[PDB]
């Protein structure tokens, strides 16, 4: 349970504004989860590798699904091929951004995701490995 | 009477030494000469378990869970019938209710008045 972020990013505050409006006047269980995720502290938003995304895109029925991470997307070297997809996130590191946009895909932000899917249709949310550490 | 690890029994001694005498617990050991029960005691406002070691003849099985089973089987029967036809069957129990109106008759029964007695 939280109600306002403890951060001081004015851009993050604008994101919270937008997604509070969407959560209030759309009635879809997607915005309600992303707004909650926009409140967590840094230790509770583990980074999501670029290969966990590929691992997720292999599930049967996930050809053109838009994959959404609400934290940071980091690179990976142990994987070699990469599908052609579109990922939405807060931040992409240099390596992960280069890999995605070089394999043909696209790297977008969260507000553009909200405008290409006001209710989060044909999407798929990913969470990082919490307790690989303490 | 032969007991297994896990069954339920009550303590009943056939003098002044110790008095649980009417509790109910689970057998957590069965040795050759005795049996062992545990009992959750209210330690102020917590339930801490005491492990007692009774004897054989000072313990008997319990029937505190026979009515539940018999009622579930009667309910199986009633619900078999309630699917066999379209019937309101009202399986639930009901607490005892207040009585209804009546008309007593003083034909062979004339009311006999009686006053209290002296000293």
């Amino acid at each position: 349970h939280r109600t306002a972020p403890k951060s001081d990013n004015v851009y993050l505050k604008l994101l919270v504004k937008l997604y509070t409006f969407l959560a209030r006047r759309t009635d879809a269980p997607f915005n309600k989860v992303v707004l909650k995720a926009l409140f967590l502290s840094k230790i509770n938003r583990p980074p999501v590798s670029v290969s966990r995304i590929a691992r997720a895109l292999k599930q049967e029925g996930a050809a053109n699904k838009t994959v959404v991470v609400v934290g940071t997307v980091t690179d990976d070297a142990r994987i070699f091929e990469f599908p052609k997809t579109t990922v939405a996130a807060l931040r992409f590191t240099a390596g992960a951004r280069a890999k995605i946009v070089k394999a043909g895909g696209e790297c977008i932000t969260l507000d553009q995701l909200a405008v290409r899917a006001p209710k989060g249709q044909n999407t798929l949310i990913l969470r990082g490995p919490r307790n690989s550490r303490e | 009477k032969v007991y297994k690890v896990g069954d339920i029994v009550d303590i009943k001694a056939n003098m002044p030494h110790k008095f649980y005498q009417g509790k109910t617990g689970v057998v957590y050991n069965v040795t050759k000469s005795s049996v062992g029960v545990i009992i959750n005691k209210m330690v102020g406002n917590r339930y801490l378990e005491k492990r007692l070691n009774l004897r054989v003849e000072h313990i008997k099985h319990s029937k505190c869970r026979q009515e539940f089973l018999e009622r579930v089987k009667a309910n199986a029967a009633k619900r078999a019938e309630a699917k066999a036809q379209g019937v309101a069957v009202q399986l639930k129990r009901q607490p005892a209710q207040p009585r209804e109106s009546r008309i007593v008759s003083t034909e062979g029964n004339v009311p006999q008045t009686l006053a209290p007695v002296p000293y």
Binding site: - | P95, A96, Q97, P98, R99, S101, T106
Partner: protein, 222 residues
């Protein structure tokens, strides 16, 4: 901005039917009540004229008011006053009479005045101090939309419907009853009688069961 006249006409026509439905319902409830009462009178007369005795039905519904304060209560009397929703003094509730609730009523006897309420006192309580619990919040009733749109899934769509479901213990007594927030009465206007209150009503006090004078108590405490 369209829908300028059709909406007003349609809503004013839709309300004019619910009004007639409520008219019919009440006109029937009244006949039922008076017929039952007159029948009981005549049955007593017939037993007397036939040389016999006619006993009535045990009362199905009691009204309970909390009389003593909140200090120096033991725990088992202290928990029944919570399960009865009697949280502060001079608060009242209805209670169905069964062998399961009579023991409750006998466990907290030294702290309550309870008895058997009549149509007039039920009606006055609901018309003056009636407040519903709507998702929370002790909302005054004051209107039929409030009752219908929160208690209508059980055929209750007015306030005489509620009074009926309470006075003749129907199938949805539990739901209708937990709808009503507990009543907050005041002290009695003429006093109590009884120099001292905490003796038995039989023995010249207030607590316990009076069975018929709860009406004279609550009509003044109201």
């Amino acid at each position: 901005a369209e829908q300028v006249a059709a909406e007003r006409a349609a809503r004013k026509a839709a309300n004019k039917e619910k009004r007639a439905i409520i008219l019919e319902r009440n006109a029937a409830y009244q006949k039922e009540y008076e017929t039952a009462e007159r029948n009981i009178i005549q049955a007593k007369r017939d037993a007397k004229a036939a040389g016999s005795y006619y006993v009535e039905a045990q009362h199905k519904l009691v009204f309970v008011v909390r009389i003593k304060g909140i200090n120096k209560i033991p725990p088992k009397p202290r928990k029944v006053l919570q399960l009865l929703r009697l949280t502060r003094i001079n608060s009242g509730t209805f209670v169905k009479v069964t062998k399961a609730t009579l023991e409750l009523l006998k466990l907290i006897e030294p702290y309550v005045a309870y008895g058997y309420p009549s149509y007039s006192t039920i009606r006055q309580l609901v018309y003056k101090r009636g407040f519903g619990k709507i998702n929370k919040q002790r909302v005054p009733l004051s209107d039929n939309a409030i009752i219908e749109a929160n208690l209508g899934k059980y055929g209750i769509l007015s306030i005489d419907d509620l009074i009926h479901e309470i006075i003749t213990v129907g199938p949805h007594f539990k739901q209708a009853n937990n709808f009503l927030w507990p009543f907050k009465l005041s002290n009695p206007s003429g006093g109590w009688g009884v120099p001292r209150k905490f003796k038995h009503f039989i023995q010249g006090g207030s607590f316990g069961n009076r069975e018929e004078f709860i009406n004279k108590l609550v009509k003044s405490m109201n």
